[PDB]
Design a protein around this nucleic acid. Sequence first.
DNA 1: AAAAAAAAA
Lengths: 437, 302, 662
Amino acid sequence: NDDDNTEIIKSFKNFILEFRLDSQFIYRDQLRNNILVKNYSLTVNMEHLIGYNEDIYKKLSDEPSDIIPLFETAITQVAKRISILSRAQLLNSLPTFQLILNSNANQIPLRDLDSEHVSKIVRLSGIIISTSVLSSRATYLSIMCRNCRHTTSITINNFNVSLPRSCLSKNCGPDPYIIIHESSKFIDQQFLKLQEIPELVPVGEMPRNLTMTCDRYLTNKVIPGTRVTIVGIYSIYNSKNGSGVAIRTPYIKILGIQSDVETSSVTMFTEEEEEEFLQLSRNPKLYEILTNSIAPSIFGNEDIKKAIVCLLMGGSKKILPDGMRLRGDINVLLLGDPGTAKSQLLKFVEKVSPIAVYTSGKGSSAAGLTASVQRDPMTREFYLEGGAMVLADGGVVCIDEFDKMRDEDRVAIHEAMEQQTISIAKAGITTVLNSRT
Amino acid sequence: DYYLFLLRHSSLYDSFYYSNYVNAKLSLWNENGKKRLHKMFARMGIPLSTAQETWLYMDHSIKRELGIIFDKNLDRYGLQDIIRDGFVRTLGYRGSISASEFVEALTALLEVGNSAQKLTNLRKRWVSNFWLSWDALDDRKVELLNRGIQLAQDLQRAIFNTGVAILEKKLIKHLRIYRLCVLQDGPDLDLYRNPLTLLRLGNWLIECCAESEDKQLLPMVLASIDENTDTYLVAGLTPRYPRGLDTIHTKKPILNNFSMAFQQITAETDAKVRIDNFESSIIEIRREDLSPFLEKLTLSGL
Amino acid sequence: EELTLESLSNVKANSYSEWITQPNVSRTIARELKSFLLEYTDETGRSVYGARIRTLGEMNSESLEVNYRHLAESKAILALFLAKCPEEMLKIFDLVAMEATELHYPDYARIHSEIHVRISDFPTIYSLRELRESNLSSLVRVTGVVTRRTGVFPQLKYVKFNCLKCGSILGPFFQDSNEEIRISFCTNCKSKGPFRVNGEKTVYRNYQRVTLQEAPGTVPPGRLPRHREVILLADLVDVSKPGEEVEVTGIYKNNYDGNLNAKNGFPVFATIIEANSIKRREGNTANEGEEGLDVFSWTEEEEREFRKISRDRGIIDKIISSMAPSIYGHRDIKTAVACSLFGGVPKNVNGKHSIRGDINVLLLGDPGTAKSQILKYVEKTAHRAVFATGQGASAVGLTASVRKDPITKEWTLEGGALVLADKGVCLIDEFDKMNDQDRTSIHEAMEQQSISISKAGIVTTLQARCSIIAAANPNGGRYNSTLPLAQNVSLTEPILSRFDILCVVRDLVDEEADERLATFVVDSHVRSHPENLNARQRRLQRQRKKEEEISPIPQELLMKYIHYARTKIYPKLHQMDMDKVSRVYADLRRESISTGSFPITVRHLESILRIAESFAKMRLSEFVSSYDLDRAIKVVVDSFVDAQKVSVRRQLRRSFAIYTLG
DNA sequence: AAAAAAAAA
Ligand SMILES: Nc1ncnc2c1ncn2[C@@H]1O[C@H](COP(=O)(O)OP(=O)(O)OP(=O)(O)O)[C@@H](O)[C@H]1O
Ligand SMILES: Nc1ncnc2c1ncn2[C@@H]1O[C@H](COP(=O)(O)OP(=O)(O)OP(=O)(O)O)[C@@H](O)[C@H]1O
Ligand SMILES: [Mg+2]
Ligand SMILES: [Zn+2]
Ligand SMILES: [Zn+2]
């Protein structure tokens, strides 16, 4: 049993230490540059793994949840080999390294997932709708007995353990153990909700939601309302607290995330795109090359496109030592005859902007835009839930059929757009909330 | 290896779909061809969802037993001429490339990359494309080959989309001596200003025509439009025997008399043509001058 | 072993359930069933099940549909055995179906290991009120509506256990989807102890359970509905949708319950229905033309007939004349309805521009013009139809609505009327009287083809691809021919411009027209009188004879043709005159508001293109020809010119005659 | 117990 684990670890270590293209060992230099900046992680591409040897990829695709931890401990073994000196014999504050994967396999829609995808590596795309608060998880537990009163340590992996029966060798109880919270190691976990993309929904149906779990460095990376591409494991976890017989609610374990925005919005750009942007800014007719690029499928409108460009760039925010604020956005209203292509510009403006939301003024309400005061049925406590004008903070909000909007609903936006802050007082909750859009 | 379009770089479904020989043998331009293809896939036993995945992530067991699957299944449909022997080159951990795939990538990179004045600009663009293709040869560059492969896929898609429309419209007029078809109007016709692209389209058309029950071997004339210059680009095409034929009826390859016909017509009549291409069977003719010329070619001894 | 069919007539055991499983008779049943589905001949003399198996192999689906009356006319005893003991017969019939499928496709097991069978139409139909103790463990056919759908979760199919007191691995065990496996002595060691699942070697199914109420159209008036629970196994997941009336054939079974016994104080048992076949029955109540789970599905021979009859000259005229064969006149209305229910082609430019591909139609005219009958026929023939009327529909009822789930207690989305109209037609009657707040909520549905909701902390956009057909009445109850359309109705330009084809019907006085209409109505009334081999097929030929006298083609063939044309054929638009259409649009921009009141915008050019594409679709052609464009432009010009005052109608008619010469 | 959406007066 242990021989196979050692063989697999040796295979992965040989892959890490022997893979080279031309005159560079890419993964060793990656480990060096990661350790220097304190990012204990490594990224593996599927194509390299398949090209090196096919048996390792076959074993990884067969039973992923059992094989991945062996790779993630081989990584830290190699890191300790190539980062510290034996010195003929310390801190050693190197936890188990995180493994991140990338792939280019065929995508699978959410509704296509079924019983044959259990315990398999799948790639899929969706939209993030809500992010849970981070919670703690135990990795290295220091455990103390009560009667014999000795010390023991438990190492816990996150993939796929209870109090040991009897004591370690007089006549203790079944489980006479307690948890020593000090001298224990903890990590972070987060929950996310994913929704099907609108264009892939089947005929006459409604979007379906799914639950994902991320941990360590993968947490706090996405924000609600951003299209993402996820690679992970589709497994099932039972619900003892929670219909039917032998039921098992499925979920996703996140291994890798790709996003279009790349979490750019301080500067995360490298030198090549920076100099490309500077050279583009040196174009002496950039104004026209941008005006022509705003919906090239719409003919005739030019001042509208110039106004849209000016709105997209946005003003310059200003503050004063006296404490007063000055607005830094411009608001454009289109008020004209039918057939002049007003909504087709609204959807394109929604598409171009990095953060944007498109909603109708008819199917909307005052409480459904700024902040809705929901109440958790379980713990029976009040909490604020974001609407639509808080999701579009730092971006642009697309409203059409503005006149069809109710008079009582149309008044809540006054302060929200003239001061860029919303104040709420409901059920004892007194919170001023910022919304700049 | 097999007569397949980028087997190791595209899915097996697309490989069967875009293959010229498979198209000719199964008539994929109408719905019965797709029904026969689905019957083929079901009888072989590869799932439709499995066959639509990349060759890298395609199932290892099926990739291993593909040879036996093909050997046992292709006989009924009569595609047993698709299997042949080819050369494969591997360098380290990069991957595997076949000679056919590499030459298709090179051809497509030549095709796409990057009055008299516009013709000169087109010719200098062509020589620049040649230099870029030449640079792509060395082993130190692979982003100049992946791009070529994806451009080959795109160009084959465009050629298929135009050929299906041609076969729908039945533009192939059957004259007494030689078949004729003219691409008067349509989409993406600017791509066909390249003689090599026109030859690719003509090769697919002549394969489709040969893979029929007709017992007439007639030369085919294909023409296009370049609205900026208002000139027709006319290329003569030789007939081809079916690939699954013995050597006894191969006493001499089919010759091409189009160059002789064009030169004789131009030397006996003051037509406004420009015969300068190294291929003597490709000429540029005027829109107003095409027809009279055509009747002349009909009346002249070919 | 006398494996003869006649020996199955008399039972030797006490019950069917313990007799069928006998080894001697089970193989006889298997071989007889094989001889049945390998040799059954239809009216044409060909094995229909062979074509069914071929199509199943093409589509690599899970369900093979076997018709009940086919098994009833020949080999009735097997049908009776299936009707009385379904669970014990479906297993053998699945085995023989798998053998038959592998006969055509060797090594098909790699695609799928097991095959599931479906029963098409049982003879007897019950309701939810009429359920007793006698019909337990037997096939039932129940019609109802879907109220709450739980979702999709996996289940264990082949359960195995590892007992660690003796190191004993239990064999593969089955699960009945409502009972837990319970083992007492734990195999040879004959002792009970700790055990584990060890699920590394197991197979999974997926289920879905739903609540079934009574249809309001069959409940006694003023009473309360009855609820049951329906369990859906694999290949039946997500087939049913909330709010959709369905008919389910299944098996009736009972199980113990503790709280139910506690509350009633008597040994009462709960009852559930496990589905075996589902048939949607929304809108299309006409269910007598043909049998089967679906009436919009075609065989290979029907596709061949479609292709054979789609090439004849003047098929457009036959299609138009074969629609509503019991309504006299109104050729323009029939043409508009055909062009609206055939639809166009949605366009996506570079994934960044969207062009709608469905046609809206507005009807207007005097009373007694049979607009509602046309609407009823449209609802009958369409695949997905939703009927709304007058003030009985609200703004939030047509679009999506937000609702707080009473169980989990959070806001959720409820599908509206327009959502059910995706890939279909939404029909509205008495469009004029509907209140403006109830009328302004479908602008996006007409034009943007999308519904956006930002309510109660939910920000979602819902796609809607629906065609709207509306009927209304002018001011005063009659159309004043000497007034423009702006003074005839209270609707405004934003709503009027979204309708492609607008028809105005006038009721005038004509002697010979009145005589002809009276003759046609009287002959129709006489025709539909309830009083004028197998008797059923004789009734069928009588119906065919009665039908062929008013319609060029049968109705079921027309419905399957419409479905096929909407599904597969996509016309393309290359060789059309640029200048003719551009000049016609310029001419229509001229006159119009510059001389009258009817609004014309860029939407009507796209409407002309969509009508041309629809006419191309009607011929099962992939490319638009010139004749289709001529027909479309003629229709649009006629519809525009025939809605003006009587002072300028002749002048405009002779002014526009140069575009539709023909 | 308190917030927010829907049909009818
Ligand atoms: N200038 C234009 N160029 C091209 N297409 C146009 C132009 N103006 C309008 N259209 C066409 O008009 C059609 C409908 O436009 P749309 O519904 O967006 O109009 P609108 O002015 O926003 O209407 P509403 O005021 O009723 O909301 C689109 O298909 C679009 O292509
Ligand atoms: N050619 C015909 N034109 C008009 N009505 C016809 C014709 N032939 C028969 N009818 C009869 O005319 C009657 C008209 O029905 P109905 O009252 O529903 O029409 P309507 O005036 O369009 O209705 P609504 O009040 O909904 O506007 C029907 O009973 C129908 O049988
Ligand atoms: Mg609009
Ligand atoms: Zn102890
Ligand atoms: Zn035992």
